[PDB]
Design an enzyme around this catalytic site. Structure first.
Site: not given
Ligand code: NA
Length: 300
Positions: A158, A245, A277
């Protein structure tokens, strides 16, 4: 809505937690998934040093939260390869204690593993966090050099994938020789173009990321003018999105992979079936998991 031509709601496309298929009997599955993530990752962390026979050294590259925990097995040589993990949390949440799922299977494959922490926005602007992260990259290479170890892999998740991207554009710190030490860079579900989220209050409330028009290119790996690509052609680059996602996150990864490829980096895009995610990290604590198998396969 770049990255999602069919988007209806731009904000929710910027919070991956609304995009899982898990806890669909929960009234708010997005909060379930976050709760679960916190819980299981903290548990993985304790299990590393209380059950799995792994040792940790607590080090620092800066004041306060600029920490590096290095995990190893004493049954393994001190000249083992180093795997570096950079955690996520939208530059404003998450810490070391939720970042160590990835450690155990790697140590069992003969790595030492460095898991790092960093200062959060708005204690820094994102620009300043990025300068601090440059201090971290310098630190990790000084550490590896001192240890006379000369094989590394970096992975970020991320926000951490976003941060890691600067390794490609800091040649005053990353020499050609340092570059040659890197076996692979792994970008897990990152974000690379910040122009859309910079203007959203749900992601960037009261502008705590400290963004504006002068610096939006500099905090956006998507937009950089990459140079001296040749020093990285010993390094494999893996850009990875999870199937579950947001379309925005998925496309940000696909496009970033395209950017790198077009610049001549040895980069690839992977859409990872079955993961969202979050569990894409949670499952790295399980040696036999699909993601674990993927990381392992990078070695060949
Ligand atoms: Na080595």
């Amino acid at each position: 809505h770049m990255y999602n031509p069919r988007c209806k709601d731009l904000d929710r496309d910027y919070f991956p937690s609304y995009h899982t298929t898990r806890f669909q009997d929960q009234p708010e599955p997005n909060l379930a998934v976050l709760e679960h993530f916190v819980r299981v990752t903290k548990q993985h962390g304790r299990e590393l040093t209380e059950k799995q026979g792994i040792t940790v050294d607590h080090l620092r590259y800066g004041e306060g939260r600029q920490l590096v925990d290095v995990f190893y097995s004493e049954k393994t040589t001190n000249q083992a390869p180093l795997f570096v993990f950079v955690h996520g949390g939208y530059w404003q949440e998450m810490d070391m204690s939720m970042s160590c799922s990835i450690v155990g299977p790697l140590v069992r494959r003969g790595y030492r593993v460095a898991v790092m922490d960093y200062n959060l926005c708005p204690q820094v602007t994102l620009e300043q966090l990025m300068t601090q992260f440059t201090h971290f990259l310098n630190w990790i290479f000084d550490y590896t050099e001192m240890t006379k170890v000369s094989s590394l892999t970096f992975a970020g998740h991320s926000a951490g994938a976003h941060l890691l991207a600067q390794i490609l554009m800091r040649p005053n710190v990353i020499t050609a020789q340092r570059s040659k030490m890197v076996w692979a860079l792994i970008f897990l579900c990152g974000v690379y173009d910040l122009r859309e989220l910079s203007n959203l209050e749900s992601v960037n409330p009261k502008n705590i990321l400290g963004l504006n028009e002068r610096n939006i290119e500099s905090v956006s790996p998507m937009l950089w003018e990459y140079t001296d690509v040749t020093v990285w052609n010993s390094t494999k680059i893996y850009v990875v999105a999870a199937e579950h996602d947001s379309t925005t996150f998925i496309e940000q990864s696909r496009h970033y992979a395209d950017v790198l490829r077009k610049k001549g980096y040895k980069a690839s895009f992977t859409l990872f079936k079955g993961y969202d995610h979050f569990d894409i990290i949670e499952e790295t604590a399980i040696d036999d998991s699909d993601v674990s198998r993927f990381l392992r396969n990078i070695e060949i």
